[PDB]
Amino acid sequence: APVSIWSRVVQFGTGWGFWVSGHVFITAKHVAPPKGTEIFGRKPGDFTVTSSGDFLKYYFTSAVRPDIPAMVLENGCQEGVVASVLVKRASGEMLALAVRMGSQAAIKIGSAVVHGQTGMLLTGSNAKAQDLGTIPGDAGCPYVYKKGNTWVVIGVHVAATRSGNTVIAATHGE
């Protein structure tokens, strides 16, 4: 009966994004298509767009996906929480990566300080040797966890370190 969580993750621009609800879609700003692109067969004027750092939210005034009930969105989680990154690949593969969430920490470079949260993959020290870490292009995939019985989404993937153990999620509530 209930909608799979994976079905909320869809391809978008040069990465992916997540239906929080029937009206709300989120992604990483740096993978999105240009301002004024028709998306999901919608014109500009059918939606409003808000962004904090590399977090990007579309709100469609008329629901795009009535089938999908609203999920609690949060601005990160308590540190130490084990969340999952729901990574889809263009091959079709779906990889849920366990990640221990670190501290809310904000850096690309100086004078362009974007905000998010780090975590370490629980996939081990040699995640990229195993084809079990992320790649750029997984950007936009969601980070989620289960608080009690309730599911909640906390951010979207932006990047990983060279040796892929540390990952970075963009956050906010909007």
Residue numbers in the entry: 1 to 174
Sentences from the study reporting this entry:
Whereas ORF2, ORF3 and ORF4 each encode single proteins, ORF1 codes for a large polyprotein (∼190 kDa) that is processed by the virally-encoded protease at five specific sites to release the six ‘mature’ non-structural proteins (NS1/2–NS7)—and an array of functional precursors—that are required for virus replication. The viral NS6 protease present within the C-terminal half of the polyprotein performs all the processing, including its own autocatalytic release from the precursor. Norovirus NS6 is a cysteine protease with a chymotrypsin-like fold: two β-barrel domains separated by a cleft that contains a Cys-His-Asp/Glu catalytic triad similar in arrangement to the Ser-His-Asp triad characteristic of serine proteases. To this end we extended an inactive MNV NS6 construct (which incorporates a C139A mutation to knock out the active site nucleophile) by adding residues from NS7, which is immediately downstream in the polyprotein.
We made three constructs, NS6 1′, NS6 2′ and NS6 4′, which were extended by 1, 2 and 4 residues respectively, generating proteases that contain substrates that correspond to P4–P1′, P4-P2′ and P4-P4′ of the NS6–NS7 cleavage junction. MNV NS6 1′ crystallised in space group C2 with four molecules in the asymmetric unit. This structure is notable for the fact that, in contrast to the other three structures reported here and the structures previously reported for Norwalk virus NS6 protease, the electron density map was of sufficient quality in all four molecules of the asymmetric unit to permit the incorporation of the loop between the β-strands cII and dII. Although the full C-termini of chains A, C and D of the NS6 1′ could not be modelled, the electron density map revealed additional features that could be built as short stretches of polypeptide. These correspond to portions of the missing C-termini but, because of discontinuities in the electron density, it is not possible to unambiguously ascribe which monomer they belong to. In contrast to chains A, C and D, the electron density for the B chain in the asymmetric unit was sufficiently clear to permit inclusion of all 183 residues of NS6 and the extra first residue of NS7 (here labelled Gly 184) in the refined model.
